[PDB]
Structure formats: structure tokens, C-alpha cells
Amino acid sequence: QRRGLSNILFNSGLKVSGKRYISNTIGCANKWSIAESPSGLYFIDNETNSLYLFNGEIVSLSDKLGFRQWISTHNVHVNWEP
């Protein structure tokens, strides 16, 4: 979500049970920065100026590897378009 990330509990008997929030405050706003991989889900949140990686727990790669400034200076509200 724009300010949320949830886990949709489904087939954990094929009925679509309720949802489960992993973070009420962190959420991707630009859909096209999300890349799937074996390691997790790499997404860039423009609201928080960070490059996260979700692998069960949200980890801020930009903060870990020192790229806060580079993304904070390059963020924009406009969505991606080709």
C-alpha cells in the first residue's frame, strides 16, 4: 500500500482468511521499483527515502550500505512511465 505492507492470508483450507500487517507505516508508492528475487522483494519507498528489502522482515539496504543521501536527493512524487 502507499503507506502499508500486508500479508494476505490465503490457503494457510483455500478460504481467503483475513490479512496480516507487517508494517503499518512503511509501504511502496511506486509499483515499478519492485523486483522479485530468491532473496526477497527489493522496493524503493519515496515516502521514507530508503531502498528496502523484504525477506520476511523489512531491511533498509540504503541505510545498511550507506545510500540514504543518494535516494533522498533523487526521489519524486511522480509515478514511473516509459
Partner: protein, 48 residues
């Protein structure tokens, strides 16, 4: 002279006895930022 001592600023610390203060912290700071913001000034004191 005879001796020296180097002081870095990893944060702001208080509540500790002056005899046992840690040189890596600052006792009191006004309008500073130790995280890199708008520039690559992380672990270096910078303005607001």
C-alpha cells in the same frame, strides 16, 4: 606538549559522571545532525 586525545561524535549522551564520560559522545549539542542528510556527512557533525 606531552599528550593528546581524539574526540569523535557518535551521538549525544548525558546522565553519566563527568569523570567517566565517553569521548565518542557529545555531552550537549544544539541544532546539529550526525546522520548524513542532503550530503554524505554521516558520523560527522553538521548543521540543521
Amino acid at each position: 606538549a606531552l599528550k593528546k586525545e581524539q574526540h569523535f561524535f557518535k551521538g549525544m549522551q548525558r546522565d553519566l559522571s563527568v569523570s567517566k564520560f565517553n569521548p565518542e559522545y557529545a555531552f550537549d549539542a544544539q541544532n546539529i545532525r550526525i546522520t548524513a542528510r542532503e550530503h554524505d556527512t554521516l558520523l560527522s557533525v553538521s548543521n540543521e
